Each structure stands twice: as C-alpha cells, then as structure tokens.
Amino acid sequence: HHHHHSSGLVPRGSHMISKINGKLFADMIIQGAQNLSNNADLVDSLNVYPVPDGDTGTNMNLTMTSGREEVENNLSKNIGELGKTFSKGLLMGARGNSGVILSQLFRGFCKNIESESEINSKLLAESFQAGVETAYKAVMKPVEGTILTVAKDAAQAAIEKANNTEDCIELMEYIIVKANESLENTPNLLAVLKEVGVVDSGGKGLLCVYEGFLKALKGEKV
Ligand SMILES: Nc1ncnc2c1ncn2[C@@H]1O[C@H](COP(=O)(O)OP(=O)(O)O)[C@@H](O)[C@H]1O
Ligand SMILES: [Mg+2]
Ligand SMILES: [Mg+2]
Ligand SMILES: [Mg+2]
Ligand SMILES: [Mg+2]
C-alpha cells in the first residue's frame, strides 16, 4: 500500500482557488468580457458561418457587455445572486447567433448555482455542463463545429478533471487546453471552416471569455 499519513501540518502555498464567491465570479465575468472585447475585431473577421457577415465578435462583445454592466452595477458576495444578475444582463442584450447561444450557455450555468453562496470545482464543472444542455436545447437545429461543440468539449473536460482536482485554477487551465483542442478541430466538422481556412468564430469568442475567467481566478487583470 502506502505510508499512512498522519502529519498535523497543513500544506503551504497560496496559488489555488477552492471556493468561488460572488465577487470572484464577477471578476471572471469582467475579465472574460474585457478579453473578448480586445479580440472582437479578430473574431468578427473569422466569421464565415452561417454567413460571412463580419459580426460574431461584435455580437458576442455586445452581449457579454450587457451582462458585465449589470454585474458591475450590482455586485454581491453571493454567487447565486450575482449569477442571476449576469444572466439577466446577457438575456436582455443578446445579439447574433453567437450572442444568443452565449446567453443561453450562461443562463444554464447560472441557474445551476442560483441557490449557492460560493461554489467549488465540482460545481463549477457541473455548471458548465448545465450550460451546454441549455444551449443545445435552445437551438432548434444544432450544427457541430461551432460554439456549441467547443462548449460541450470544454464541459466534458471540466467534469473529468474536477473529479480529482480541487483547485479551480488548475481546472480552468485544463478546460482551456481542451476547449482550444476542440476549437482547432472545428474545421474537421464544418466544411466551410476548412475550405476558408479558419476556426469557428463563435468558438473563438467563447475561448476568449474562458481565458479571461482564468486570469481572474489567478487574481490578475486583462
Ligand atoms: N445552428 C447553430 N449551431 C451552433 N452554432 C451556431 C449555429 N448558428 C450559428 N452558430 C454560431 O454562431 C457563430 C456566428 O455568429 P454570428 O456572426 O453572431 O452569426 P449571425 O451573423 O449569423 O447572427 C458561428 O461561428 C457558430 O458557432
Ligand atoms: Mg449577423
Ligand atoms: Mg455573423
Ligand atoms: Mg497552479
Ligand atoms: Mg484537430
């Protein structure tokens, strides 16, 4: 077997997050929104599906900004309450296919935590999963190779990793790795992406939000 551990010492270190309260979630939202805003022109230029109308980044940015502004004006330590504020802002500001889907992903995420004051890594993962289920149900004819695919693959990664990972920083790092793998695979699912030579614009915007989430978990700003 192993050495039977009985030391009274508690491990040292401070660069881990085991609980996410409403203010940390707000910081995630704010940095995710800022990172998306900084990448909006690129995300627009990648847009080819359904139509190459140059707007995915703008659409997602405006949607996320509506959520961010509600959050900044109504902060709370209670993550469930903060999520209600964020969800409302997204849902009253959603634009484009991408912004509608984004608002539905986060509607499901936030509903899953509505009665919590803080969440751990397992509940974070479960909430990404809940968001994916809400978004697929909201789209009448889901297509693979899109923001839905990337969100789905990210949530599957989250559930697998959280089962043995208490640290939300490590969890979010892994989610981003796997979301990026999914995003790079989108042209293998959706023909126009491969023909033009781009990844999915909605999925890229979602990865920008997730990368801001990670920055906030580390106590950093975009
Ligand atoms: N049926 C669908 N299933 C999954 N994702 C979709 C669908 N339709 C659009 N999208 C997502 O939206 C992105 C384009 O967003 P956007 O430019 O806002 O669209 P639009 O200009 O058509 O409203 C795509 O990259 C894709 O991920
Ligand atoms: Mg459009
Ligand atoms: Mg478009
Ligand atoms: Mg670490
Ligand atoms: Mg690949």
Curated annotation (Swiss-Prot):
It comes from the Bacteria. Residues 23-215 form the DhaL domain. This is Uncharacterized protein SA1069. It comes from Staphylococcus aureus (strain N315).
